[PDB]
Amino acid sequence: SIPVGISLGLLKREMAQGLLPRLLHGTLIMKDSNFRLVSSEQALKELAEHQLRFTCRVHLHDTRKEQETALRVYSHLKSVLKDHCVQHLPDGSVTVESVLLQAAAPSEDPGTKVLLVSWTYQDEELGSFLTSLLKKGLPQ
Amino acid sequence: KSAALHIDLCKATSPADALQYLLQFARKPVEAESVEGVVRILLEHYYKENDPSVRLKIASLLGLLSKTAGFSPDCIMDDAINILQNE
Amino acid sequence: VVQHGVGLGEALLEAETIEEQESPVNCFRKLFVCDVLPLIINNHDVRLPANLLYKYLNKAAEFYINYVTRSTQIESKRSSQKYIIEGLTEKSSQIVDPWERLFKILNVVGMRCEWYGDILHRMKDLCRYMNNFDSEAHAKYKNQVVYSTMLVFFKNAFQYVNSIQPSLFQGPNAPSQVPLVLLEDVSNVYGDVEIDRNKHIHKKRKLAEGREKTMSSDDEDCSAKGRNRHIVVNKAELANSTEVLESFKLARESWELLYSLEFLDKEFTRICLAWKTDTWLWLRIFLTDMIIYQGQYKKAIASLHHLAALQGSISQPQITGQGTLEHQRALIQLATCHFALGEYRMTCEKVLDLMCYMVLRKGSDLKLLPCTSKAIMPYCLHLM
């Protein structure tokens, strides 16, 4: 068995969040015969947490209000996805698991409106289904 | 006598003098009305204090005070669990 | 709901006022905002006027200010401001995301007239044409856009107050956030290019104060030093203050936009006078800092003095020109205002009274630091 190290912050958060059968996603800096499996954010000093932020764009033809669109998307996802997150967000946005949805500025074409959805590799399996669900789009 | 505590403890130092004085108090028994007075002021100092060890001593003698023979503990128990939630 | 209509909200507001909470911050008002008023706004049958929506927004702002800066009385990520409301427990008078409640109140106000982070570009685009529109026919949507911009500015001001003085809102039994203070033009004595010319000795008094209207005459024309300058906070002293500096910059930008409109400034001044928004340490300190940065040093100092006197009358301990557990922010703010106004002799007197309280791309810069004695000793040394 290979003895390696953990950051106590990551371990404490994992126990605290898990005790109320999920996964533990981590990153190991396998240095010269000395290993260290920490969270990604902990690697920032040793640069090397230079973040790789993803974003998948969703083509929606609606031009409705941001708060109303976010509330309807949240309700639609809570209907479809079985009790992932039932919560009223402060900023009038959407996030299921650890994805990030942003009603960004559209392209230079006045006839095109696009919604953007950022996430991580942890939540991509649900984010792809979320984007495929919203591929049909809100009622135009 | 509880007004003596009301003067000295808020006019003491945080780290050890309060702890040593609190330890001194634990060696004398208390009467039930004075028990109510002391649990009230100790809850007040528990509110104001931020050190862990001093609060540990506060709670442990609060437990020693509830062990006293004749009084009703439910009324102070209400506020006791009220602060237990945010600890 | 046709049985009472607007009666329920008015009765709840009256009940909130009767509990020594005349300003709409009591738990009755909180319950009305969370449930009664939101249901009335959501209900198509109930159609309130614009004044009711504005009052609901004011009540939400009072509740948020109380939950963000008022003391709790005992006798990827998300965040909400919760505290002990008047007449009900904190968790027993629960409101889901009061900032979202205020945003939804603004949205309901816009919906009455029909016609943000994710929409930050969209919010900026709306704010661009929010002060040069046509009359009422074209201003039906412009009023909604102005209200949305004001709500965004209020959110930015709340974030700045959260990074400026939210330590006095919560106790020590659980983890919390620390307060912070601003600084005058004294940061131009650290960098290589930044040479000692930010305030000098007599130059600051000559070029800053001018003996303006010392009273708190808000909702008026301020200076225009922010047009081609700002508080450029160097990363060499605030390298870990990304949230604090970001909130400060957002508050400065909103305050620059705030003075452009007359209705928004009048509404903010009316709220401050009626609901005593200056009696909350965080919001008053943040607004005073934004006004001072915008070029309203006299009115900002007046508001800061009113807030300091209100805190002194309050149960928080106070000291004569020296820092305390809660008076450290007040002392730092007074010293910073004295440095900004260039009163060299008064600054020296304050330093002498605060020596025991002390801790042992062009023009001036800024920084981000805590509201404790750290913000007073090094800034005073730089001024000297």
Side-chain angles (χ1 to χ4, degrees), chain B residues 47 49-50 79 86-87, chain C residues 171-172 174:
Chain B
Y47 299 142
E49 185 55 352
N50 83 298
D79 303 50
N86 58 59
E87 177 49 67

Short mmCIF file of all heavy atoms in Angstrom, two decimals, chain B residues 47 49-50 79 86-87, chain C residues 74-75 171-174, unseen atoms left out:
data_model
loop_
_atom_site.label_atom_id
_atom_site.label_comp_id
_atom_site.label_asym_id
_atom_site.label_seq_id
_atom_site.Cartn_x
_atom_site.Cartn_y
_atom_site.Cartn_z
N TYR B 47 -21.88 34.33 26.24
CA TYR B 47 -22.16 35.11 25.04
C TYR B 47 -20.96 35.96 24.66
O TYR B 47 -20.51 35.94 23.51
CB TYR B 47 -23.38 36.02 25.24
CG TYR B 47 -24.67 35.32 25.54
CD1 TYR B 47 -25.58 35.87 26.44
CD2 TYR B 47 -25.03 34.15 24.88
CE1 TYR B 47 -26.78 35.25 26.71
CE2 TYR B 47 -26.23 33.53 25.15
CZ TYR B 47 -27.10 34.08 26.06
OH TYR B 47 -28.29 33.46 26.33
N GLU B 49 -17.74 35.87 25.62
CA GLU B 49 -16.42 35.27 25.49
C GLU B 49 -16.25 34.57 24.13
O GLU B 49 -17.22 34.14 23.50
CB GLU B 49 -16.17 34.27 26.63
CG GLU B 49 -14.78 33.58 26.76
CD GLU B 49 -13.54 34.50 26.81
OE1 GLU B 49 -13.60 35.73 26.61
OE2 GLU B 49 -12.46 33.96 27.09
N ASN B 50 -14.99 34.48 23.69
CA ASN B 50 -14.64 33.79 22.46
C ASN B 50 -13.62 32.67 22.63
O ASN B 50 -13.45 31.88 21.69
CB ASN B 50 -14.09 34.80 21.44
CG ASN B 50 -12.62 35.10 21.66
OD1 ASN B 50 -12.23 35.61 22.71
ND2 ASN B 50 -11.80 34.79 20.66
N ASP B 79 -32.86 28.42 27.32
CA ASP B 79 -31.82 29.28 26.77
C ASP B 79 -30.51 28.53 26.61
O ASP B 79 -29.72 28.86 25.71
CB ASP B 79 -31.65 30.51 27.66
CG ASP B 79 -32.93 31.29 27.82
OD1 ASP B 79 -33.96 30.67 28.16
OD2 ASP B 79 -32.92 32.52 27.61
N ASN B 86 -25.89 27.26 18.20
CA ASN B 86 -24.94 28.07 17.44
C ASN B 86 -23.50 27.85 17.86
O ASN B 86 -22.60 28.48 17.29
CB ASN B 86 -25.32 29.55 17.52
CG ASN B 86 -25.37 30.08 18.94
OD1 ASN B 86 -24.39 30.03 19.69
ND2 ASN B 86 -26.53 30.59 19.32
N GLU B 87 -23.25 27.00 18.85
CA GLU B 87 -21.89 26.78 19.32
C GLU B 87 -21.12 25.93 18.31
O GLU B 87 -21.67 24.99 17.73
CB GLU B 87 -21.92 26.10 20.69
CG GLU B 87 -20.55 25.75 21.25
CD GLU B 87 -19.60 26.92 21.19
OE1 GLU B 87 -19.83 27.91 21.90
OE2 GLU B 87 -18.61 26.84 20.43
N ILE C 74 -29.87 38.80 22.49
CA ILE C 74 -30.14 37.59 23.27
C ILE C 74 -30.54 38.00 24.68
O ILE C 74 -29.83 38.77 25.33
CB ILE C 74 -28.93 36.65 23.30
N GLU C 75 -31.68 37.48 25.14
CA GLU C 75 -32.19 37.81 26.47
C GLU C 75 -32.88 36.60 27.10
O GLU C 75 -34.06 36.33 26.84
CB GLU C 75 -33.16 38.99 26.39
N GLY C 171 -21.88 37.17 16.60
CA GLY C 171 -21.08 36.95 17.78
C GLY C 171 -19.88 36.07 17.50
O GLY C 171 -19.58 35.74 16.35
N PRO C 172 -19.16 35.69 18.55
CA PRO C 172 -17.93 34.91 18.39
C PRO C 172 -18.09 33.39 18.52
O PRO C 172 -17.09 32.68 18.35
CB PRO C 172 -17.06 35.45 19.53
N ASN C 173 -19.29 32.90 18.81
CA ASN C 173 -19.51 31.47 18.99
C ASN C 173 -19.36 30.66 17.70
O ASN C 173 -19.22 29.44 17.77
CB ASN C 173 -20.90 31.22 19.59
N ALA C 174 -19.39 31.32 16.55
CA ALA C 174 -19.27 30.66 15.26
C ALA C 174 -18.35 31.49 14.38
O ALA C 174 -18.08 32.66 14.67
CB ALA C 174 -20.64 30.50 14.59
#
